[PDB]
Amino acid sequence: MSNINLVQLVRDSLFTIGCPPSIITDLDSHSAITISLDSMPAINIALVNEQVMLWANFDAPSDVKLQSSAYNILNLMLMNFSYSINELVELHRSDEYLQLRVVIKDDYVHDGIVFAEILHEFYQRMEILNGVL
Amino acid sequence: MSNINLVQLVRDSLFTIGCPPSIITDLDSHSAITISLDSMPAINIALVNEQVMLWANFDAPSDVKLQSSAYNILNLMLMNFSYSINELVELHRSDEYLQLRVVIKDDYVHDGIVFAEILHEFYQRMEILNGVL
Ligand SMILES: [Cl-]
Ligand SMILES: [Cl-]
Ligand SMILES: [Cl-]
Ligand SMILES: [Cl-]
């Protein structure tokens, strides 16, 4: 009914990573949470169908850029992600963005220390994608 | 419970596609169903946690083959698939295979005519992957 517990989870996770809660923002008690990052798209976190979803919107690359970076991107996408409901991080393409998305299993969203590791790994996947875009 | 309703769904779908229910095989009433195809991996279909999953196992390509085919595989994986729970067909490393996998939304597994289109599109994606491996 509210994002209050998700906000607290993210906050708790950031104490463990070593970042301040000043980078965490939201619109209201029902919106997605945003973690602003330097030189990278923000990490968005929200409850979608009672499941925690993390996503990042990268500016969509041209077809030719995707071609020169395809091997690197494919290898990234084939990497298992243990906390995901399907064991993977997903890539969704729209006209404007190439979006990295993952839906986390309920087993891992009730412990800020574990969620810190999830955020850290998602950030690492984002770093790899950012480096080849 | 059992794969009886799923077997009936699959065989019904095949009549609509123009194939016989002879290409449909299974081990018993609790196993996955397998549709044998000529010159391509079989299509596997099973109920996994009350959800219908389709998957096909392709022999995993070497690293050098992946380098040349990465762009085509990536383009394929970014294609929307409307019947999937995440709007995509998934690609997983699975033992010695590259596996195409999709979990179908419950909305589309009670009508053999609709499921026929699902099988047809999954087969089309398999054809695309097969052509670059
Ligand atoms: Cl939560
Ligand atoms: Cl982070
Ligand atoms: Cl069913
Ligand atoms: Cl078919």
UniProtKB/Swiss-Prot annotation, chains A, B:
Presence of keyword Chaperone: yes
Keywords: Chaperone, Plasmid, Virulence
InterPro entries listed in its UniProt record: Invas_SpaK (IPR003065)
Keyword Chaperone part of the UniProt annotation: yes
Coiled coil: none
Purpose of the protein: Required for surface presentation of invasion plasmid antigens. Chaperone specialized in the storage of effectors within the bacterial cytoplasm, maintaining them in a secretion-competent state, and allowing their immediate delivery to target cells upon contact of the bacterium with the host cells. Has been shown to chaperone IpaA, IpgB1, OspC3 and probably also OspB.
Similarity remark: Belongs to the SpaK family.
Complex and partners: Homodimer.
Protein name in UniProt: Surface presentation of antigens protein SpaK
UniProt source species: Shigella flexneri
Gene: spaK
